[PDB]
Amino acid sequence: LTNKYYCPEVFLDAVATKLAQTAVLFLNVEMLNDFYVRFPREVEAKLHEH
């Protein structure tokens, strides 16, 4: 990895994979878990009101 400026492809792919994975963790907890918990409550309320 010492000649990063000589090999931009592998470097940019490493950055992309890293950003992707840590963002994936925070996403899974926050957005995904909140969806699993809030979604049924919203379905019930909106269907009843409809």
């Binding site: 470097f11 490493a14 950055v15 890293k18 963002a23 996403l27 969806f35 269907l47």
Partner: protein, 50 residues
């Protein structure tokens, strides 16, 4: 695949409920992700295995 294959109106109510929950969490998820990425924006140092 669900039992709401017909009744497109109620199906739309369900779909729109999902959409509104996701919309409610979207910003908080995004901001939290950018805060979690704050260190990698400064120096996304790459490990040899990565």
């Amino acid at each position: 695949k669900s039992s709401f294959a017909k009744h497109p109106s109620a199906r739309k109510v369900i779909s729109d409920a999902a959409a509104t929950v996701l919309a409610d969490r979207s910003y908080a998820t995004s901001d939290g992700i950018e805060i979690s990425l704050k260190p990698y924006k400064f120096d996304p140092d790459i490990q040899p295995n990565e």
